[PDB]
Structures are given as structure tokens and as C-alpha cells.
Amino acid sequence: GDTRPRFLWQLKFECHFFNGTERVRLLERCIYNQEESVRFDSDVGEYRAVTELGRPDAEYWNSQKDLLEQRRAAVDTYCRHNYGVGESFTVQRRVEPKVTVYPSKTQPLQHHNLLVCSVSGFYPGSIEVRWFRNGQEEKAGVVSTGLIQNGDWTFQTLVMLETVPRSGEVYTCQVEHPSVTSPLTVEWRA
Amino acid sequence: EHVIIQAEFYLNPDQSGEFMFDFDGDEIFHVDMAKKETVWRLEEFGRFASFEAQGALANIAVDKANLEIMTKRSNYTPITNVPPEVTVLTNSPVELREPNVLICFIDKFTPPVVNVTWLRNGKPVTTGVSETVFLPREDHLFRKFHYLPFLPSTEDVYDCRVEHWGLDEPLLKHWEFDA
Amino acid sequence: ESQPDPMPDDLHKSSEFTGTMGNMKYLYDDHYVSATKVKSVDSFFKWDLIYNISDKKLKNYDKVKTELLNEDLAKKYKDEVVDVYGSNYYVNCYFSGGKTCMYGGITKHEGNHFDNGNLQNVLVRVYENKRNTISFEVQTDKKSVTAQELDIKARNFLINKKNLYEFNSSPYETGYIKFIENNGNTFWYDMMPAPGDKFDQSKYLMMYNDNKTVDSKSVKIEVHLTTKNG
Amino acid sequence: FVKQNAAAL
């Protein structure tokens, strides 16, 4: 067995975009094991220690003007540049969700019908799933499994709705997503 | 509303190194440290953009030198093993005899070293399985995805066996047709 | 079985390379790392080994990293007293005194030499447009030598006597060097750079990855070249 | 894409 202690070091450069490239924040961070020790926040303008472990580094790096000026302009040469490079296939990537409605396999309490609205294979993750009973939105009884990121640039989610079904009622699952101009709807006819 | 992360790491004594780009949590690419080439997460990205993989190795060398300096500075304080949270799901609702994919989600763990194996009816699978590299997390722990394409049936049962230093015993997450 | 010989379509064409051939020439023109009886002192990644080897020539380095095909190969020679011989590069050479990099080129030192500075001759027959034009021999101080070492020596000779490589382009359109082992096994390396306007020295040298060795007293070498028109 | 160079400690 391998019992040797491990020593880990991570370096991350995060480009945060607001309203496209209008507002950009660059966050450079160093993490020893699970402890972030020093970082460079473009909103601050210089390296700052996050813990005592990183004090020597912030001080040393802030003494190098060439490093400091590159970091201060990186918001443009690094962040905005990379955004322009990947925008067409990342920011603008769109894959329509597959939507289907069927009753849950469980169905606990008798005179009740737990409905399931399955929404999968979509991108981006931003999505709106709502339930309606005869054209009026259902706030109560609605429960979601959450937004699941599949790791292959795809998302999925399950949004349930408990109902006291009455013949003739129409329960609609409506999905709004950037991939479509108008909402997608699937109806359960009770 | 959008975040692009260049994430790298070096780990001793495993001598493991990684360099990757992330977009809103999804990997754009990572560099193969041995072949010294860019590995795009999705085939098409390679036709829409490029990256000089060779140069990433310059960063990994600096990362290693920095790790050793920090290791000594901390008086050789080792990392605390944090066991993974493991979940198994299908990429889409399962339908009998309808092609699907089993996803083994390994999350919130560190250090970035894990052994994952798929088991179909108690026996190890290998056909068509794929996996991603370690993905970054805001808390600085890692995420990872392992995949297994399969054909649903009421007979075939599966298990995702995960080993990690933070786990006293191998963790097996079971899966089988129920719907 | 042995690797199938190359067909015209399988070989790089110098006419399809618009970069500077001088960068290929550089790797074989009196250029090589050579050390005798040394042991690795470090490793960057698990498939590589780092040695303290100085550049007696022009003091350009005192640390050399050689990458191998896999971790097992590295484990194999990690604590061994070995000899090193290979073609090094600097562009894109990275690892944590100057530094230089290379691939393979490792052979155990223990009982791999000839008593009294004796060298083993290895036959090299050169073919130009399918006809033997010149034949010669290269030498090695090893019984079991890397194909890389022999390859380098053959090209160094051909650069000086046949202008195998010149500053810009080559007199030849295609070229491959074939090794024939006494057990019948054969393999070859393309001697021309990949198509395009840039030559990636590191990527090209990576082929020496396997640390392939052959028996110097019985191995035979064939260099097959072609001119664009004939 | 372009990378940010790692700063040496």
C-alpha cells in the first residue's frame, strides 16, 4: 500500500465576465493543499496574501513591476481575448432539451398522481421549467431534483408535480430555454 | 454571467500534473503532459480554435518548483484526504433496449488521485468506457466523470467502484433498471 | 512481426516542408549528449529521468532530462548505472546550470562495453532512388546500442558527405533509415520533417521514446533516399 | 486561446 503523505499545489486564473466583455474581473489564485494562500484580484490591482503562508509571495510578486503591469492588463490581453476566441462555440452554444412527461414509478399516497417532467440533453444550463393546471401555474406541490451537469456539455433535470387528478384536467410542463424562440410544452391529460 | 478558468496543479510524490481550461464548469480542453498536445473535450472545439500545448509544460515546471518551495515552507504539512461523494446516474431517462450512458460522478475530493472501475453483474467492464481529467471546484477540491455506454435490460446490474485514500474501503455505487 | 516498409505515400516530402531545414540539420550535425557510467538524480514526470551531465563542448547545460515511452521504462533505469547517448533539444525543453532535453538513449553500463577502448563497426548501406550509391560504417562502444545512437551517427556522416540536410531544404525528397536485426525483425524512421512551415524538434525526437536497442555486432542499417525527379 | 504564465515564487 502507498501511505506516503501528499503535497498538492494548484494555480488558477479565473476570468469572470459580466454582460459579455463589458465588465471583466481576473482572479489569479494559489492553493497549497486545500488552503488558498495568495491571489491577484484585478479589482484590487496587486497581489494580496490570503493567509500567513502566502505573505512572502504577495510581497515578492508586488515588487516586480513587469509582473504587476502584465497582470493589470491581462483582463484585456488574456480574459477578453480568450472570450472572443471561444464565444461562438461556448457562450453561443445551444442544444435543445428533450422533454417528456410520465407519472412517477413511486406514487405513494393513494388518490394522488405524482407527475414527472424530464428535461435532458440541453445546453446551456440556464433553464426554466414550470407546471400548469388548466393554464394556471402551480406553485405548490412542485419539487425539483436540481440541475445536473453531465460533464459532456450537457445538462438534465427532473421537475415533479403532485396532483389530485380529475378527469378532463390538463397538466402542462412548460420549458423555456435559450435554444428555443418560444416555450416548449408537454401535456398530461388526466 | 460567464467564467473561464485556466486550472493547473502538480502533486507530489505522484508527480501528477494537469493543465486545463474550463467554461462555466465544463472542460474546454486539457493538455496531454506526455504527448504534449491539446485534448479537446468535444471534437468540434478543435476545429473552432487552437492552443499551443507545448507552452503549458513551462507552467507545470514552475508549478512543481513552487510546490517544493511551499512544501518545505509549511514544514512538510501533508494534505488531508477528503473522500469523494459518488453518484451514479444515466445521462437520460432509461428505456429498455434503448442505448444510454451510465455516469459515475466523483465529486468534492482531494488529492486528485482516484481509481474507478465499472462492474456489470459483479464483473469488471472495459468496453467503451471513457473518463475526464480532474475538474476544479471553488472550494479547491476536485470533480471527475467516468462514463459507460450500455444497453438497458432487466438483467444487467452495474456498480461504480471508487477507491481513494480518504475512503477506508472501496466505495461501490449500484445501479439497475427500476423504471 | 516487424514493421511494414514505407510506401511513397507513407513518407514525408521535403517539398511539402516550407520551414528551415537547418533546424533538422541542427539535431544531427555533430550534435549529441553523451555520458558514461552515470545514474539518474531526479525525475520531472514518472516517465522521465534527469541526469547531471555537463556540456564539455560549450557549457550549454549541466542537467539533462530524457523522456521515455512509459513509467515502466523509467522505473527500469532509475537506479541503474548507465550510459547515455542521444540528440538533445532546447526549444520547449522544460523541467524543474543550463538544461537540455531528449528522449530514450539509455543503456545499462555494466558489461556492455569492449575491453581496451575497442569499438564495434556497424554497416550502413545508402540507397538513392533504389540503387546502392555508397556504403560505410559507424562505430559504437556498446554491445547493445540504441537505434537512436546509430541513427545519429549515420546522419551526421551523411550531412557532411552527402548534404543530407542543408540550411533550407534538402537535395532529397524523401528518406528513411531502416534497421535490420539478425533475428529478422526490422523497423524504420522517417528522416524528413512533417509537412508545414515549422519543424517541431521535440515532437520529431519523441520517436526515440521507446529506447529501442539493437545488437551492434549483428545489426545492419539501410538508408533509403529519393530525389524529387530522379 | 492564450495562457497566463505561471509566476515563480
Side-chain angles (χ1 to χ4, degrees), chain A residues 74-97:
Chain A
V75 77
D76 294 324
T77 66
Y78 175 65
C79 293
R80 292 191 168 83
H81 174 63
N82 286 334
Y83 184 99
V85 173
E87 173 171 34
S88 71
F89 58 94
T90 58
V91 174
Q92 289 158 36
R93 182 166 207 276
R94 271 143 188 56
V95 179
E96 195 185 321

Side-chain angles (χ1 to χ4, degrees), chain B residues 93-162:
Chain B
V94 63
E95 310 289 6
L96 290 181
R97 296 182 189 178
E98 177 255 58
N100 207 308
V101 182
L102 274 175
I103 302 174
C104 186
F105 188 41
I106 311 177
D107 193 25
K108 304 182 177 75
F109 71 92
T110 200
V113 180
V114 297
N115 178 62
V116 187
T117 58
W118 286 106
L119 301 173
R120 174 186 290 138
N121 300 314
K123 282 160 285 184
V125 188
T126 292
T127 61
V129 307
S130 64
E131 69 185 72
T132 71
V133 296
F134 299 88
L135 312 174
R137 284 178 52 83
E138 169 61 44
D139 52 31
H140 305 129
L141 295 174
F142 299 86
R143 311 158 70 197
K144 190 161 159 54
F145 298 83
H146 273 72
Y147 307 97
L148 168 58
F150 72 120
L151 201 71
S153 83
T154 61
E155 299 178 2
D156 289 322
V157 291
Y158 299 77
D159 296 288
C160 179
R161 184 169 178 287
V162 177

Side-chain angles (χ1 to χ4, degrees), chain A residues 5-7 9-13 15 17 19-20 29 32-33 53 57 78 123 149-151 153 156, chain B residues 1-2 4 6 8-10 12 14 24 26-27 41 73-74 77 79 90 137-138 140 143 147:
Chain A
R6 304 295 130 154
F7 304 105
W9 175 259
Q10 289 176 261
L11 168 59
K12 305 177 173 181
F13 296 94
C15 287
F17 301 96
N19 200 311
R29 36 216 303 224
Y32 174 44
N33 281 323
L53 216 210
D57 311 318
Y78 175 65
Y123 191 95
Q149 186 165 45
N150 301 315
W153 291 71
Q156 69 175 298
Chain B
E1 55 184 3
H2 288 302
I4 293 181
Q6 175 185 321
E8 353 179 330
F9 76 67
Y10 191 87
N12 266 331
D14 310 73
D24 290 358
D26 284 303
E27 174 187 357
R41 185 58 181 75
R73 194 146 96 204
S74 75
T77 297
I79 189 167
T90 51
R137 284 178 52 83
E138 169 61 44
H140 305 129
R143 311 158 70 197
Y147 307 97

